[PDB]
Amino acid sequence: KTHVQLSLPVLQVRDVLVRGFGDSVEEVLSEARQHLKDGTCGLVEVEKGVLPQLEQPYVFIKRSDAAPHGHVMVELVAELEGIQYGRSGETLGVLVPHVGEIPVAYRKVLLRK
Structure with a gap:
């Protein structure tokens, strides 16, 4: 499938144990x-104050469209030293590895894969 329905655990920045995905866009x-x-x-x-607590390069999910079955359509845009790789809509948040942190909420997204 070109799109996959996901429910992403929303983490508090201060709980996050692994603050990025790696070292290149x-x-x-x-x-x-x-x-x-x-x-x-x-x-x-x-x-305010979230991104400086995480590791660059950043991966954003950005709204790709204006929401099947409650799932907002999103795509990935990376950022390193103020340059973004990709073009898309409004940021829903920054992605990080989940290694068992307790979430505060879930964000239903439809990911362009």
Whole structure:
């Protein structure tokens, strides 16, 4: 399928144990996609002071359309030293590995895979 219905655990930035997916734009997008497929991907909602607490490159989920079965259509955009790889809509949050942190909520998304 070109799209996959996911429910992403929303994590508090201070709980996150692994604060990024790797060391290159290509690696973080690769790793993010693998974790999304394996159900091992968390979401951190971006506010003032969140991003400087996480590791670059960042992976964002961004709204790709204006929401089947409650699932917002999203795609991945990476960012490194203020340059983004991809173009999409509004940020829903920053992706991080999920290694068993307790979430505060779930974000239903339809991921363009």
